[PDB]
Design a binder for this molecule. Structure first.
Ligand SMILES: NC(=O)c1ccc[n+]([C@@H]2O[C@H](COP(=O)([O-])OP(=O)(O)OC[C@H]3O[C@@H](n4cnc5c(N)ncnc54)[C@H](OP(=O)(O)O)[C@@H]3O)[C@@H](O)[C@H]2O)c1
Length: 175
């Protein structure tokens, strides 16, 4: 087994109702729907009084300064957005981590065990937050998709489905 239960229905808590998280725009996120989903989410939801930064290497997806496009091109802000080495703060208070579409960018293997097929680095210690929403089908390859057992601790994880189903059910249609 792993360590989760409700899919996006859970986001509503770590997303549309989680004092402190970090939208981690991975490959799907912006190219999934998050781009405009986490966009309205980071707004209609940040207004509730919840924080939302972005936990991802400054390259989690296609180009480098691109995942910030879904944040900018959509509407979400990048001032509360931390690339990588500075994520030590985002996840320092985030009692969650909406890890949307990321995959090898969060490979906590470096945080858990270097045995991984790669070497990892200062990823975005996402599992090291309250909950975590790794939204994607399942066999997410990415640049590595290796060691990522992060989905085995306190309700922190991945929510099978498309990043478009992520914010659509939580911030766009919980119940
Ligand atoms: N950006 C650059 O210029 C650059 C340059 C050199 C190295 N890198 C490195 O490349 C890595 C990138 O990490 P990352 O997490 O962003 O990358 P990935 O691991 O490259 O991420 C791809 C992930 O997004 C998902 N995905 C793809 N299409 C999707 C879709 N249509 N809808 C929903 N999900 C989709 C995939 O899983 P699912 O199919 O399960 O969704 C996949 O696992 C980093 O280690 C980085 O340092 C980047």
């Amino acid at each position: 087994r792993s360590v989760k239960a409700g899919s996006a229905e859970d986001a509503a808590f770590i997303m549309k109702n989680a004092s402190k998280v970090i939208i981690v725009p991975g490959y799907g996120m912006a190219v999934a729907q998050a781009q405009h989903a986490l966009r309205e989410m980071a707004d209609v939801l940040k207004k509730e009084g919840v924080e939302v930064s972005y936990a991802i290497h400054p390259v989690a997806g296609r180009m480098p300064g691109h995942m910030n496009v879904l944040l900018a091109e959509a509407n979400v802000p990048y001032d509360e957005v931390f690339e990588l080495e500075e994520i030590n703060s985002s996840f320092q208070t985030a009692d969650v981590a909406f890890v949307i579409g990321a995959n090898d960018v969060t490979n906590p293997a470096a945080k858990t065990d270097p045995s991984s097929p790669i070497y990892g680095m200062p990823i975005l210690d996402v599992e090291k937050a309250g909950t975590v929403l790794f939204i994607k089908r399942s066999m997410a390859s990415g640049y590595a998709g290796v060691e990522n057992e992060l989905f085995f601790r306190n309700n922190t994880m991945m929510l099978f489905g498309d990043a478009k189903k992520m914010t659509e059910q939580i911030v766009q249609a919980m119940n």
